[PDB]
Symmetry: C2
Subunit: 205 residues, 2 copies
Amino acid sequence: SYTLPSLPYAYDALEPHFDKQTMEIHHTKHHQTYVNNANAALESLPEFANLPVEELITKLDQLPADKKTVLRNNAGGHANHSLFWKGLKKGTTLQGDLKAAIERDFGSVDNFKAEFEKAAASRFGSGWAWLVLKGDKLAVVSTANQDSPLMGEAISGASGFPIMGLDVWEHAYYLKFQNRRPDYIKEFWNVVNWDEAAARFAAKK
Amino acid sequence: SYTLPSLPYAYDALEPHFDKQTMEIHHTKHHQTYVNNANAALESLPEFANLPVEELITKLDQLPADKKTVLRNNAGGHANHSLFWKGLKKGTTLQGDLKAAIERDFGSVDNFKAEFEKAAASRFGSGWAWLVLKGDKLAVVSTANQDSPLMGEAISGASGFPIMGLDVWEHAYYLKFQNRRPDYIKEFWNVVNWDEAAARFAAKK
C-alpha cells in the first residue's frame, strides 16, 4: 500500500513564497486523496500493489483496461507530489554540474527560466511543468492533470527523467495568487530545491 | 470580435451559495482572458470571427492547423462561460416539458441528479459537467478544460446541445470550497437556472 509521505519541513517552511494554508491542504487533502484512491484501485492487484509508484506509472499499459485510468490519475498524482515536496526548499543555489548543463542546453540560466516560465504558463487546464533529462540533454516539457514524463510519450505527451517540477493545478496556487499563475511561477524560483535537483541530476536516473 | 458580456446580476446575486469574490474574479479575469485570447487568434480570421462563438466552436476542424488549439481553448472558454452566467439564477423550479423529459430519459429527477453529480465529481482535472440534448434524448456528459459538447466527440469526447452546465475548474470553487468539490456541486442545485435550461430545451437549436 502507498502512504502519504510526511513533509520534509513544516507547512510554513516555504513562506513568504508558497503559502502555508495551501501547503497544508495540498498535502493533507489532494495528495492524500491520490494515495487513498490509488490504494483502493490497487486492492485487487497484489502484483502491482507491491511496486514502487514511480515504477507503477511506467507500466500503465500492463494494467487491466478498467484500471489504467484510475491509476494513471492517482498513482500519477502520488508520484508527482512525492517528487514535488522533496523538490522544494529555501536557500539553495543553482551551481555545479547542473548549472553547467542548463547553460549548455539553454544558453543561460535566464533563458532556461524563460522557457520554463513559458511552458508552465502555457499549460492549459490542470497539470505540471517539468525540467527533464532526455539523452543527456536538459529539456522543458509539460504534462496534463497528474500525468508524468515517466509515463512515456504515448500516454503523457512527454518523456524523460524529471529533475524538478512545478504543480500548476489551480489548487496549488489559487488561494494566494488566484488567476495570477505567472506570479506563482516567479515565486517558484525562490523555493525550488536546487540541491535535490542537483542530486537527481547527479544520479542521472 | 467577441465582447465580454456583462452578467445578468450583481456579483453577489448567487449568495450564500456561490461566493461573490469568485464570481467577480471568474468573470473579470478568467472569462476576460478567454475573450482576449480568442479575439487575438481571430484577428487574422475575419470569416471565422464573423460567426457566433457557439457556431465557431463547431468548425474547429476547418481552422488553419496553427489556430485550432488556441481557439478550441479560448472560444470554448468564451462560449462555455457565456452559457454559464445565463445558466445561473436563484429560486427557479424544474417543471414543464423539461422536467418531464428528464423523468422520461433518466427514469427520475433523482437518477438524473445522481448521474450529473457523478460526472461533475469524476471529471479529473479541469472541465465541465453538462446536461445535453442528443437528438430527442437528454444525457449527462463531461468535457475537459474549456471543451464543449458542441465541438463534437472527436474533439471533446462528448456531443450534444448543452441545456445547462457546471464549471468544475478549481478556479470556480477553490476560494470558498477548496478541495470540497462535492460541496460546490450540491450548491449548484440552488443556483442552476431551470428556466433558461427550459428555454434552451424548447429551442433545441
